[model samples]
Target: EYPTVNEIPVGEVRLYQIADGVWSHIATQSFDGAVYPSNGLIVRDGDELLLIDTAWGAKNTAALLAEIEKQIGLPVTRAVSTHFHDDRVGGVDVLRAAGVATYASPSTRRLAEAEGNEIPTHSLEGLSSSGDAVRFGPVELFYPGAAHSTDNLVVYVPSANVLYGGCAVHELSSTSAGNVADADLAEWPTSVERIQKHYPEAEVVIPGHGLPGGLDLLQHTANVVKAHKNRS
Candidate 1:
C-alpha cells in the first residue's frame, strides 16, 4: 500500500506516504549500466508545499513539479537541500527559476559553489548546530553531526512523527554505507546516535535510499557503520 514505484518522465520514482501531509520521493537515474536511486521528501504546509531535495536533474525536476501539482493542487513554494550532492540539490536551479525559494546549509552552499553545482537561492546558517533544531513553518530541520556528508541534514516533522534521514542514515537493508567519498566515518555513529536520542518518538523513518521503515532504521544504520569500521 505504500512505497510504490512508478515510471515518470525522468525515470522510475518511488513514492511513499510516511505520514499525513508528508511524502517521500525516491527517484532513480541510470548511469554507466547501473541504476542509482536518490531520495527527496515533500511536506504539505497549509496552502503551500515544501521540498526537501530535488530530483536528478532539470527535466526530472519539472516532471516532479507536475506530479506534485497534480497530487496536491498546490505549487511548491520552498525547498531545502540536505547536502551538496547532485542527487540532493540537482534541481535547485530549475526550482529557483520557477520562483521556488530553495535553501541549503552554509556548508552545503559552500561545497556546491566549489563544485559548480546548482546553488540554492538562500543559505541557512547560524540557525542550529549539532544536536539543535531549526524550525521553519511546520517542519524542523535537525543537524545531528557530519556523517554521510559534512552538511547532511535530517528533516523532522513533529506533528507527523516522521523523520526524513536524508543520506545521513541508511536503510535497514543497506549492506554498508553506500557512498562515502565525502563521509565522516569516524563520526558517523555519533551522528546517528544524536538523531536517535533526539527523535525517539519518530514512528516513520525514511532514509535517503531504499524503503522507509520504523525507528529501527536508525539503529540498523549505526550497526552498519560499526560493521563497516570493523571490517576496515
Candidate 2:
C-alpha cells in the first residue's frame, strides 16, 4: 500500500505514488480562512529525481525535499516550476540552494522577476509562450496556452504516462475556475483542449490543486472553465 497521510506530515505537504516512479506532492496552505491543497509532481529518473513543482513555502519545501530523499533514496537533480505562482515556485530557493538545476519558462521568469517572487535557477530554452516543448529525459514540459495563469504549463512523464496538469487544469469537482485574477478565461478551455490533443498517452492526470484522476480530468477542467465563464 502507498504511504498514508498519517505516516508523514511536513507543515501541510503530503505525497502519494500514482504510477511507477511518479508521485504527486501536495502542499496544503491556508488561504484566508480555509486550507487549499496544491499538487507538485516527482519523477524518478535513473539515478536522480525530477521535481516538477515546489511546496507551499521554504519550510514546507525543505521538508518535502527531505521526505523525497528519505522515500526515494535519490536526490532531486532537476526541477521545474510550471508557472510563476508561489504554489508552483514557492520553494524555488530551497531547490536552487540544494544545487538542483531548476528550470522555468522564460515568461514565468519574467513575471516572477517583475513581481519580486523567487525565480527558478534556469530558464527553458526554445520554449515559446504556447504549444512549445522542452524535453528532459523521460519528462516533457509543455506549454498549452494561457489558462489559469498567463504562463502556465504542464509536465508529462511519457514513460509512466502521467500528466501533471498544473493550474491549467481544474479538479473534477470544481464548481468554478477557483482563482481568475490572473487567468485568461476566454482561452482557458482551449488550453485544456491543446493538452488533450497532445498527450493521448496520459493515463493518470494530476491537477494543480486537488485530487488526481484519469483522462477525464482534461474534459472536467474544460467543463469547469465553461461553467465559470457562463456564470460570469
Candidate 3:
C-alpha cells in the first residue's frame, strides 16, 4: 500500500503518489489574493530520487527537499528543469547547493539567464531540440516542440505509465490556456498532439498545475488550444 497525501505545514506544499513510484509535489504561491499552484514530479527508483521541476522558489524548494527526505528517506540525486519560468527552475540554486546534479534544455538555460534566475548545471542541448529521449535512471524526458513556452518539456515513467506534461498541457480544470506571455499559440495544439502521440500509454497525466487525471487531460488541453486559436 502507498502512503497517504502529506502536506508540509511551512510551505503549504502537498505531496502525493500518482503511481507506484511516482509522486507529485504541488506548491502554492499567493499573489493579489490569488493562490496559484505549481506542480512538480518526484520519482523514486530504489534509493535514488529524480525530481522534475522545482517548487516556486528557494524557500519552498528547500522545504520540499526536507519533506522528501523525511518521508521517502532518499536524496534527490538529479533534477530536470522543464522550462525557465520561476515556477519551474526557481530551485536550481538550492538543488545545486545540496550537491544535486541539475539538467535543463539549452533554451531553458538561456531564458533563465535572461530572466535572472538560476541556471541549470547541465544543458540538455542537442536532445532538447531534437525531441530525442534522454534517460535518468528509469525516467525519460522528451521535448516535443514548444507550447506554453519555447523550452517546455515532458517527463515520462514507463514503468509507472505516468506522464508529467509540465506546462505543455493543462489540467482538466483549466478553462483556458494560461500564462500565454511566452506561449506559441499557433503551435500549442500541435505540441499537445505530439505529446499524445508520443506517450499513448500514459495512464496518468500530470499537468504543471491543478489536479492530475487520465489521458483526458491531454485532449482537454488540445481542445483549449484549438479554441483559443480559433478565437484569435
Candidate 4:
C-alpha cells in the first residue's frame, strides 16, 4: 500500500507525501459524470524541489505551485516529464513562467512540440538510452526504451530505493490497458523488464495512477501489457 504520510488538496489536485522527501500529486479533471486523474512526482532536495511533471493543465499547475510555496515551503528548481502526453507535460507552461527549468527526453521534446503540448524547456538529449542512468540531484531519469509511449521514462531514486514507473507501468487496480495507440506494445514488456533488471533494489514502486506498490507493481504492469496483446 502506498501510505500517505501527509497530503493537501490543491483545487482538483491532491498532493501526498508517499515516501520520505517524495511526494505524489494526483490531478483530477472532471469528465461529464466521471473524473480523470493523473499522477506526478515531486522530490525534495535540501533547499529546492524537483517536480517530476506538472499538474493536469495550466490552471491546476498554478494552484500546485501556489500550495507548494505556501504549504510545502520550497522552490521548485527543476522538473522533468517522462513522456509527451498532455497529462505529463500540461503544467509545463506554468512551470516555465515560475522560472522552473523543465527537462524531457529528446523524443519527448520533439513529440510535445509537434503535438502542441506544453513543451519542456530543456532536453535530456545526452542520457543515451535503456538502463542508462542520468542523475538529477535526488533522483535519476532512466529511459527503459519505448513502452506506454515512445518517449516514456522511468525514474529511480537511489537514496530512497524508489522506482517511479510513471505511465510506462500500470497500477494493479487498473483492469484494462491504458492508451496504446502510441505505445510500443510489442516492446512494452521488454522495456519494463529492463527497468526491473536495472533497479532490482527498488523496494518502493510508484505507478502513474492509483496506489503504489513494489516489484509486484512492475510485474502487474508487464502482465497487463501482455494480456492486452493476447486479447483481440
List residue ranges in candidate 4 displaced over 4 A: 1-10, 31-34
TM-score of each: 0.94, 0.94, 0.92, 0.92
Per-residue lDDT tens digits of candidate 4, residues 1-232? 3333134233456677768888887776543565566778889998999999887788888888886787789999999998998878988988998899999988898999999888999989655566667888899889898899988989887888888899998877886777787999999999999998989999888888667877898888999999999995
Per-residue lDDT of candidate 2, residues 140-201 (tens digit): 98989999989998899998899999988877777678889889989989989999999988
Q: Rank the candidates by lDDT, best first.
A: 2, 3, 1, 4
Task: Report clash pairs, candidate 2.
Answer: none
Question: Model 3 segments beyond 4 Å from truth?
Answer: 1-10, 31-33
lDDT of each: 0.84, 0.85, 0.85, 0.83
Worst 10 residues of 4 by lDDT: 1-10
List of clashing residue pairs for candidate 3: none
Model 1 CA lDDT for position 78: 96
Residue-level lDDT of model 1, residues 1-232, one tens digit each, is 5442344324545556777888887677655666666778899899899999998778778778877887777879999999998888888888999999999888899999998899998988753478867897678998898889888889999999999998988878788888888999999999999999999999989888777889999999988988888999
Off by over 4 Å in 1: 1-14
